[PDB]
Amino acid sequence: FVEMVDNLRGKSGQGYYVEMTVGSPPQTLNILVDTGSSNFAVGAAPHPFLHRYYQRQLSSTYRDLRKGVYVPYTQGKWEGELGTDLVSIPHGPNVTVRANIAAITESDKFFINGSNWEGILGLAYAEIARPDDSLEPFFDSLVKQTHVPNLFSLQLCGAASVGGSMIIGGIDHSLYTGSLWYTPIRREWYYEVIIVRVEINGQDLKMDCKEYNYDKSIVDSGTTNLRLPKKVFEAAVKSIKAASSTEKFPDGFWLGEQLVCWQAGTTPWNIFPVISLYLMGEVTNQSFRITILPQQYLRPVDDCYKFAISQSSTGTVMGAVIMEGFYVVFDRARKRIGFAVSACHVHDEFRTAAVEGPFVTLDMEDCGYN
């Protein structure tokens, strides 16, 4: 699918977006690819931060649903008017579908000043769509209305400008090396998965794996960091702090309350441990592990970086920190997510991200939270 290669762009920390068109004639917009939500929402008014916006008055195929939607966040939020219209992805499958579209008429802390995107494409399932699971997510409409396979894959390459590929309806084997390894999608709402073991430099935290997924563990392209439950994060950092004991860093650093800087290319990468997450495999008692480097959780912001690992109350969230090291296949058809070493991931000549298996892991089910 050469046509779809390199169809993602963005700026460090501002997420990855793909070009899309909405309405008739087609109105072009850059839309954030978010596997962590399920609403297709686009700016529809002249907010100062927006390069452009959806103008419903110019679309002959626009249809009003006469319903509003308010989506609150920890601080900001977005609110819009629901409708449907014809949507297409220029550098994606050659098709056009009628999908729900929330026209954003008011928001706070949603749009980013200086960013180049005007909307968000929630690729998750209806269960978490707003206002409720009755609002059919875009991908569902795309598959239901066309012959596009129920699957998509993401290769986030993270470089201030970033790039990547979203292969819609398939897999592009040139984007990865080695074999793809699959972990089951526990439940179809967020792209939930189960982490069965966690290793730092090869030594595991030996913590009731159930904690690792309290109350969730998800794969989300819309989040920059690797979010971990408090308990897991506490021990996580504890081990990383011990591995990197070579140098001393402030407590704020580990809490993302302050940045850490190093002179021109003087970052002590080797001082930091690799993080290995073992994921539930496809077979009983079988697992595999994906391993990332500081290159992923120690990202640039001298050279100042922010610890890309943080705590959560919503569970584990495998964001760009994890994804930028692998080619990730969202195999909706088979309810599984595949990981393979990405052909574009950044690595030093000493350590490289990897996906290895099979491994024997017992009681993987006790890792899932109910």
Could you please report the per-residue DSSP string of 67-79? EEEEEE-SS-EEE
Give the helix/strand (H/E) hosting 276. strand 275-280
Question: Can you say how many angstroms the Cα of residue 162 is from the centroid of all Cα atoms in its chain?
Answer: 14
> Could you confirm whether 204 is annotated as catalytic?
no
What does the alpha-carbon distance between residue 351 and residue 269 come to, in Å, rounded to a whole number? 10
d(CA 34, CA 314): 17
Strand, helix or coil at 301?
A: coil
Type of residue found at 20: M
Chain breaks in the chain (C to N over 2.5 A) after: 159, 301
The number of CA neighbours under 13 Å toward the Cβ of 330 is: 27
Question: In the PDB record, what is the listed experimental method?
Answer: X-ray
CB neighbours of 319 closer than 8 A, spacing ≥ 6?
220, 221, 222, 223, 224, 225, 226, 227, 308
Q: Which of 188, 185, 192, 132 is CA-nearest to residue 314?
A: 192
Out of 34, 85, 140, 331, which one is annotated catalytic?
34
Cis peptide before 215 (omega within 30 of 0): yes
CA neighbor of 119 nearest in space, from 47, 218, 67: 47
State yes or no: is 6 an active-site residue: no
| HSE, side-chain direction, 13 A CA sphere, residue 341 | 15
Identify the H or E element spanning 230: helix 230-243
Identify the structural domains of the chain with CATH numbers, from first to last. 16-148 (2.40.70.10), 149-370 (2.40.70.10)
Phi-psi region of 58 (alpha: psi -120 to 50; beta: other; left: phi over 0): alpha
Is residue 196 within 8 A of residue 279, CB to CB? The reply is yes
Which 3 state secondary structure label does DSSP give 135? Answer: coil
Q: Where are the alpha helices (DSSP H) in 97-177?
A: 138-145
Cite the DSSP H helix spans in 244-335. 251-254, 294-297, 320-323
Which single residue is written with the structure tokens 């526990």?
186
- Phi, psi torsion values for 63, nearest 5 degrees: -140, 125
Q: Determine the 3-state secondary structure of 271 from DSSP.
A: helix
What strand order describes the sheet that includes 354-360? 203-204, 195-200, 275-280, 286-292, 354-360
- Active-site residue among 85, 140, 220, 331? 220
d(CA 212, CA 227): 11
Residues in Cβ contact with 355 at an 8 Å cutoff, skipping those fewer than 6 apart: 178, 179, 180, 181, 288, 289, 290, 291, 326, 339, 340, 341
Nearest Cα to 52, choosing from 115, 9, 96? 115
Q: 302: which DSSP letter?
A: -
Distances (CA, A) of 339 to 157, 176, 186, 314: 14, 9, 16, 23
Location of structure tokens 């495998």:
318
Quick one: resolution in A?
Answer: 1.9
- CB atoms near residue 76 (< 10 Å): 12
Tokens of 237: 């950092």
